[PDB]
């Protein structure tokens, strides 16, 4: 059957002597060459420069919380950067963050020493965890810590940052305690002054360059990923591929997910409108999100092979008719390619002289076997 078009005709009719006529043997479908995905420009970038190298950081007890939303966050780019010494993501992988979407994310910027880096993690008990900042056990997020010895350590000593040595009760997860009330460790009530049983809860950090790496200051930013069963305000940047025209390709224009050959079009969309439609509720035009140009979508060419044969008693050569398909845009091509309204038939050579109709083709064109 697959040897040659005459053999395909023989197989379709299930005979060995096919008579003069036209026989639709199979369908010619043009497969998509490639796939293209286009998405709008990254706009309103998140202010991650602050959580990277802000001029100052808050103390761990009064940890600063920053709301990040309505922007595009490149968590993968954050992971690639080697400035961060510690990049722990207990909830989910850092690389999946770029693909994933969250309705809101918060950054917790605070300064703790290297030895206290462990205390900020699920499943961990410590003085910083108990009285300064606590993490939920089921919390999904990334803990980012990098060395801040040059920034937050001085020869005289950096005592600006404060941490709470003790408190009446352990701090709840994601609870910020800035209270300066003097702690009471005895039955005698505190009177707001230092006493034998009364000690100030906050303690000044000891930061010096000569101190060990664990004692050396570190700036820690904690990213919290939260879903409220609501559409995601912040998401990772979406991949964009260069647009290709006049080639049947798979296209994804902000979720159209269609297949067709794209063409520049003269129809004028309304500025808010994105993708057009025809009468029969089928997509017919789309606007490129990157550049506001309107692209028509005609589908990939298809038709019927429709072998043109004379009687096998007379000849063994045939002509292949590719209906509604022009061969230039797309038996192998290059052998007396003739194009008519019904299609672009292959294997028969056009003649201006007109005779009686023998094999119908379409639009007044009739094929025949003649010298």
């Amino acid at each position, epitope marked *: 059957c697959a040897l040659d078009p005459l053999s395909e005709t023989k197989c379709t009719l299930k005979s060995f002597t096919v008579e003069k006529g036209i026989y639709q043997t199979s369908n010619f479908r043009v497969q998509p060459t490639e796939s293209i995905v286009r998405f709008p420009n990254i706009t309103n970038l998140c202010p991650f420069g602050e959580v990277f190298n802000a001029t100052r950081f808050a103390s761990v007890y009064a940890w600063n919380r920053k709301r990040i939303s309505n922007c595009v966050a490149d968590y993968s780019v954050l992971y690639n950067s080697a400035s961060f010494s510690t*990049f722990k*993501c207990y909830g989910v*992988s850092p*690389t*999946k963050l770029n693909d994933l979407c969250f309705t809101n994310v918060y950054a917790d910027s605070f300064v703790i020493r*290297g030895d206290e*880096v*462990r205390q900020i993690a699920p499943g961990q008990t410590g003085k910083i965890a108990d009285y300064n900042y606590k993490l939920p056990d089921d919390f999904t997020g990334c803990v980012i810590a990098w060395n801040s010895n040059n920034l937050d350590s001085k020869v005289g000593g950096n005592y600006n940052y404060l941490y709470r040595l003790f408190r009446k009760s352990n701090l709840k997860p994601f609870e910020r305690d800035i209270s300066t009330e003097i702690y009471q460790a005895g039955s005698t009530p505190c009177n707001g002054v230092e006493g034998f049983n009364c000690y100030f809860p906050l303690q000044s950090y000891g930061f010096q360059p000569t101190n060990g*790496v*664990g004692y050396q200051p570190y700036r820690v930013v904690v990213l919290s990923f939260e879903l409220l069963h609501a559409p995601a305000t912040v998401c990772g940047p979406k991949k964009s591929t260069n647009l290709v025209k006049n080639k049947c390709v798979n296209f994804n224009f902000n979720g159209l997910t269609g297949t067709g050959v794209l063409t520049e079009s003269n129809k004028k969309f309304l500025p808010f409108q994105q993708f057009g439609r025809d009468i029969a509720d089928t997509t017919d035009a789309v606007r490129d999100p990157q550049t506001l140009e309107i692209l028509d979508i005609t589908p990939c060419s298809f038709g019927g092979v429709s072998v043109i044969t004379p009687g096998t008693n007379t000849s063994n050569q045939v002509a292949v008719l590719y209906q509604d398909v022009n061969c230039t845009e797309v038996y192998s091509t290059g052998s007396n390619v003739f194009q008519t309204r019904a299609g672009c038939l292959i294997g028969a050579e056009h003649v201006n002289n007109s005779y009686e109709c023998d094999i119908p083709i379409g639009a007044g064109i009739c094929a025949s076997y003649q010298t």
Partner: antibody, heavy 120, light 106 residues
Framework: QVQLQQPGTELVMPGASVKLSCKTS????????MHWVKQRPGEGLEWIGE????????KYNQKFKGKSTLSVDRSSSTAYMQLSSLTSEDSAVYFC??????????????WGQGTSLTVS | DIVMTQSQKFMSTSLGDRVSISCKAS??????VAWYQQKPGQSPKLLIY???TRHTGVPDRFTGTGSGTDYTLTISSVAAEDLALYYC?????????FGGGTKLEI
């Protein structure tokens, strides 16, 4: 309970390729990475690399780059590590490890049963 | 990269005595040192993941001490189950390097 099951007693011929399996159960596979550790009696224990499930990010130790290929299957929660061009030096026991966090640093809170690879 | 060196490979200790296992660090890794125990034909088990905080399940006998570049794994009383292979691991940064191992014996 968290379990990381490995077949063990692997037997291969030099120059071939082996696909060591680390079956995991009792814990969510997607929320954590996967690490492999090689154990030679004369070289002790050495970390091989890290693979992120449902991700294309792969990191190999410089010594074991190319020698070991990390593969992950989301279905059935199985982790694979392919060793190509096996020599006599590759004859060792390989441990799959469950990281405490999907990232770095990590201290390998949990470990697998281990496959004893022999190259003969 | 950072290398872990356990100086002594095979060492002897009597049952019920207090013993200390030494691990050396080439660079100041703060307190990021982990210890594991491996019985023959058994998977390694985490004992003390940072410098002093013991893993879940492990007895109070194992106590991790040390800071800076010197780190020590101490066992208050040596049991028959404690006669195994022990490793020290640094988690300061990637790549990850373990110790040379140390086996307890009578």
């Amino acid at each position: 309970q968290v379990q990381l099951q490995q077949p063990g007693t692997e037997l291969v011929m030099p120059g071939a390729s082996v696909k060591l399996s680390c079956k995991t159960s009792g814990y969510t596979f997607t929320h954590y990475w996967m690490h492999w550790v090689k154990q030679r009696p004369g070289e002790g224990l050495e970390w091989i690399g890290e693979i992120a499930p449902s991700d294309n990010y792969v990191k190999y130790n410089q010594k074991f780059k190319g020698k070991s290929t990390l593969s992950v299957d989301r279905s059935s929660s199985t982790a694979y590590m392919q060793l190509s061009s096996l020599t006599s030096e590759d004859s060792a026991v390989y441990f799959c490890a469950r990281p405490d966090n999907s990232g770095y640093p990590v201290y390998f809170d949990y470990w697998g049963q281990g496959t004893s690879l022999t190259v003969s | 990269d950072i290398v872990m060196t356990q100086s002594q490979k095979f060492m002897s200790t009597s049952l019920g005595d207090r013993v200390s296992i030494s691990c050396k660090a080439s660079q100041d890794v703060g307190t990021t040192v982990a210890w594991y125990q491996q019985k023959p034909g058994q998977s390694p088990k985490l004992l003390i993941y940072w410098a002093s905080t013991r893993h879940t399940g492990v007895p109070d006998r194992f106590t991790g001490t040390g800071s800076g570049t010197d780190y020590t794994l101490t066992i208050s009383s040596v049991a028959a189950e404690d006669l195994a292979l022990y490793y020290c691991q640094q988690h300061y940064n990637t790549p990850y390097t373990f110790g040379g191992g140390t086996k307890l014996e009578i």
